[PDB]
């Protein structure tokens, strides 16, 4: 199809720092 | 390409008759005055490289 464009981000984003 | 002899070793061993290698003893190049004459005396004549190091030397001198 024409149908062919994927610009998948970076992870997605929000949160996490999980105690250091 | 031809192997290159590990040039440093070439200048410290000589293939002997049966295929041994003979070398000069260490410990006889300086700080001598404090060493027994007996010790220094025994360090003059060349000696055969031991069985354990043969592997090394040969790999250094393919064209020995």
């Amino acid at each position: 199809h024409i149908c062919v464009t994927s610009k998948w981000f970076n992870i997605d984003n929000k949160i996490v720092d999980h105690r250091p | 390409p031809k192997i290159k002899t590990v040039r440093g070793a070439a200048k410290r061993f000589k293939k002997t008759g049966k295929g041994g290698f003979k070398h000069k003893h260490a410990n006889l190049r300086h700080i001598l005055t404090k060493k027994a004459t007996k010790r220094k005396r025994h360090l003059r004549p060349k000696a055969m490289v031991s069985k354990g190091d043969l592997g090394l030397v040969i790999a250094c001198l393919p064209y020995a």
Binding site: - | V6, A9, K11, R12, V49, D53, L56
Partner: protein, 143 residues
């Protein structure tokens, strides 16, 4: 008859392939073992290297000195000379019989046994045992 020829038995060993399955005997790891520098593409350590320890060919002292004159001296066996072609074994001549090599400028005759045809050797050196063998075969040794 061009499909009835076959090579001598045990002249064509197959030769390790490795990396092809459990049965093969050399699967997965391919006889390289587990991990370390020695596995891994382009692994290994250079010749003489024996861990960071000072290597044998460096603990021991140099003792060279190359004659350079020696490089142009040949040694001759008694077994030669018969093959010199002309009963005169000369400074070269041997050279022409391809038993010395052009660059040579010196030569001893060495009791390396067996001389028969009487021969006169000229301009060479010759050991005590060689002289004796030559002479005892009707040979002559003029300088």
């Amino acid at each position: 008859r061009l499909n009835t020829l076959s090579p001598a038995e045990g002249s064509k060993k197959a030769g390790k392939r490795l990396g092809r399955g459990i049965g093969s005997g050399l699967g997965k790891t391919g006889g390289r073992g587990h991990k370390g520098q020695k596995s891994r593409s382009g692994g290994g350590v250079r010749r003489g290297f024996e861990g960071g320890q000072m290597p044998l060919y460096r603990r021991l002292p140099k003792f060279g000195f190359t004659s350079r004159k020696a490089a142009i001296t040949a040694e001759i066996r008694l077994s030669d000379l018969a093959k010199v072609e002309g009963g005169v074994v000369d400074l070269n001549t041997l050279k022409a019989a391809n038993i010395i090599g052009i660059q040579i400028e010196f030569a001893k005759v060495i009791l390396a046994g067996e001389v028969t045809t009487p021969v006169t050797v000229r301009g060479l050196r010759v050991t005590k045992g060689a002289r004796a063998a030559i002479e005892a075969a009707g040979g002559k040794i003029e300088e």
